[PDB]
Amino acid sequence: ISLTHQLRTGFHPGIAFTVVRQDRFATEQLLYAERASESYFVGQIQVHHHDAIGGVNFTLTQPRAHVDLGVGYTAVCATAALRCPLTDMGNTAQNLFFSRGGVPMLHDNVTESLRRITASGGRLNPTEPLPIFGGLRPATSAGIARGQASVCEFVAMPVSTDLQYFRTACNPRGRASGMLYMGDRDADIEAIMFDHTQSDVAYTDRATLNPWASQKHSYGDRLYNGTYNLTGASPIYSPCFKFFTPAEVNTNCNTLDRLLMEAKAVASQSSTDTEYQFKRPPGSTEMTQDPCGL
Amino acid sequence: LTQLTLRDAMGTICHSSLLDVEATLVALRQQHLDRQCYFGVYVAEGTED
Amino acid sequence: LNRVARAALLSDLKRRVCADMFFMTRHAREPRLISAYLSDMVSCTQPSV
Amino acid sequence: RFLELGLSVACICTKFPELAYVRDGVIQFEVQQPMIARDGPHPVDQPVHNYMVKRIHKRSLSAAFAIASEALSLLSNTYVDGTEIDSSLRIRAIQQMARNLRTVSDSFERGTADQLLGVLLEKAPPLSLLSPINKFQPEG
Amino acid sequence: TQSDVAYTDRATLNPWASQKHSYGDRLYNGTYNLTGASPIYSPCFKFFT
Amino acid sequence: VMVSRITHTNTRGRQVDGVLVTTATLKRQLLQGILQIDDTAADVPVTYGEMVLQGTNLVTALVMGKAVRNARVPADLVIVGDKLVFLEALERRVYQATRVAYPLIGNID
Amino acid sequence: PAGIIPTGNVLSTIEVCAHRCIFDFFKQIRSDDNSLYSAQFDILLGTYC
Amino acid sequence: TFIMPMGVFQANSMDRYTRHAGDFSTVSEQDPRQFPPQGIFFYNKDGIL
């Protein structure tokens, strides 16, 4: 209740805060193309049958199939800007009490002075009495003028040096790097992704990014990992759900043609819905892109 | 341009998963802890002196 | 366009209300582009029979 | 139209309308590769070859319109009953299914360009790297 | 029943007032009328609601 | 490899090329001042296909079971390198004025 | 259900259902089945060189 | 092969000239451009000091 003191009024603290940026960046499409091998067939209209409400029917017909005969394959393109330009912003927080799993009870009503005295600095703020255990559809909120909560997801990068790594290159969980894909071999990602032997996969001028988080099962990302329940009770793409996580080796891993073969679709992250940013209900397998995967 | 000066991190890290001791240390149990002994940590009650 | 793409295209409706349509009125300077004031709307916003 | 425009010559005329009494296509083609050796004392290299084995996709169908009970509702006649005066009945019976089975049986004639760029635009990503797909790899 | 509309994160910049009526609704609106007597045009009646 | 009979080009003798997409203003940008119009008259074909079988070869194929093996138009010519190329692209032929959606432009993080 | 022309006529009218312990494959259809009608076969598309 | 000096200190007093009044000064009481340098800062393979 003092830590956020020096969150709340005049001593900018012993801690601090930040931003990044989330939006809607729509992308249309042009490309080159050469001669005749895409083969195109033409045909007729086949069946079943059934009846209904008032209606019976022609949705029957004319089925296709197709061919992947490829030594290599074929399509290349250089490109154009955005259209007239779509981008809008602005500021506050994220969620960690909608959903359950914890343990009981020998102090309450004053941290009851802490979402009745916590949830600060922006639109709309929460509740009093605390029932249990649900999927949780509630009250009324707002419809659209600027920012579906266009909002953060904190990382942080303690502290210090001279003038080129936040003055030249750089990014959020640490180093211009690369776990080594397909090469020497694929059962070393505990001392190339977990333990240690040498100097820096980029910036060996000094050893990793910020003095206190650079291995296995730790805290500020204890915000993050995902077997036991926080892909189970409050659903999140979460700030990141592939920045510290399971990625790939058991099918087709041979440096080059899967240099044509892995950055894709999984059950995933952040697309066009409305108002603050959910995760799983039923209902929508679309296939947005995500430049910036691995 | 727009401000962001002085107002919010208090819906926010009064947070629960930081006091943290079951499962993390758990997931790294079983070794032999690297060269380190007391410097001094034990304690006592007087000294009958 | 339900709650995502119907609030920020007509967000594309006050910019091309607030920089560019006085585009040959102002200075003696910056001329010929038939492109987006002159060469973008008699054939791609439409006719009848 | 689909002759004189463009929206097709890059494919091949080969044959199956009624498709799939055809089960079964894993169809392929080699490349032979010939004898390289360098000049200079450098290692083994062979007249090598590449043949090929397989997997491929698809995405279920139909195309649209839907209304009420005309069919039987006056399909009960057909050469006795209805003798005198349904003039505008069949009058208004001639013009209104030539414009939506002319425009409602050419929907897959609104169907055959957007499932060959949803895996021709959903099996091909981005650019800056092709360009050194011809400046960094012939020998290795 | 909650936050706001227009401009999301602060229900004011300079403080003092934003629901129905006192010096608050008439000094541009349309249900009780004291822009006074006879013929109004320096206009903002239909500049309040 | 290339092999077939004849024909596809600009207007004097020999063959060709592929396939395409987007929308509207870029046609209108290499028009005011860099490129320009590029070839003239085309004797170019008209149709699809058909086929004729019944007897001993599907005797291979109904009881055991596998299976082994001009009309003028400007839709016309632009040029890129020392070629030609072509540009008048799909926003003149399909689908106005109603109510659902698909792949395409929209948004990306 | 081979559709090929039969080679020879079998001169034995006995209930083969009794001796199901010989042969390798045994199906009895009472009158007819739609399993009789399935024309699945296995495509090539040619030589490439 | 690239070459760079590191701890070189310009001994001659006339060489410790600044191109204007403070063409490298401070707010602190002691302008520590007078202290001998101890490092060298070069653009990497990468545009990186």
Side-chain angles (χ1 to χ4, degrees), chain A residues 137-152 154-158:
Chain A
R137 295 292 301 272
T140 180
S141 280
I144 314 193
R146 294 181 69 87
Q148 168 175 357
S150 183
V151 313
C152 300
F154 286 62
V155 179
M157 63 84 73

Side-chain angles (χ1 to χ4, degrees), chain D residues 35-101 103-140:
Chain D
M35 271 325 288
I36 272 175
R38 263 156 288 289
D39 198 2
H42 297 90
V44 297
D45 51 0
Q46 296 178 356
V48 69
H49 292 265
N50 307 125
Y51 304 148
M52 273 285 197
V53 293
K54 312 275 275 181
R55 53 170 310 140
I56 280 160
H57 156 85
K58 280 168 55 74
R59 326 173 68 192
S60 279
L61 315 195
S62 56
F65 172 26
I67 308 279
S69 193
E70 320 205 319
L72 60 92
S73 75
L74 194 60
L75 182 56
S76 66
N77 50 333
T78 75
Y79 272 82
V80 166
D81 184 357
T83 177
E84 182 61 17
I85 194 63
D86 295 331
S87 65
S88 182
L89 182 62
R90 293 181 186 270
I91 288 309
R92 299 173 43 166
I94 195 165
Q95 301 314 75
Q96 204 63 253
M97 260 66 69
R99 268 176 306 234
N100 192 0
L101 278 296
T103 65
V104 179
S105 73
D106 273 28
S107 194
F108 321 132
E109 196 98 15
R110 329 281 178 276
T112 289
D114 188 49
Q115 280 170 350
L116 184 138
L117 285 50
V119 72
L120 263 191
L121 274 293
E122 187 185 4
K123 199 182 53 67
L127 181 52
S128 66
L129 282 73
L130 192 84
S131 180
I133 300 298
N134 278 284
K135 63 89 176 178
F136 203 70
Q137 179 70 254
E139 178 194 7

Side-chain angles (χ1 to χ4, degrees), chain D residues 21-35:
Chain D
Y21 290 142
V22 165
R23 292 177 64 190
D24 175 346
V26 301
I27 63 170
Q28 69 275 16
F29 45 82
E30 76 184 293
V31 298
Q32 77 174 355
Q33 300 175 30
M35 271 325 288

Side-chain angles (χ1 to χ4, degrees), chain B residues 6 8-18:
Chain B
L6 290 152
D8 295 323
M10 59 224 68
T12 291
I13 196 166
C14 282
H15 200 68
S16 191
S17 295
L18 179 74

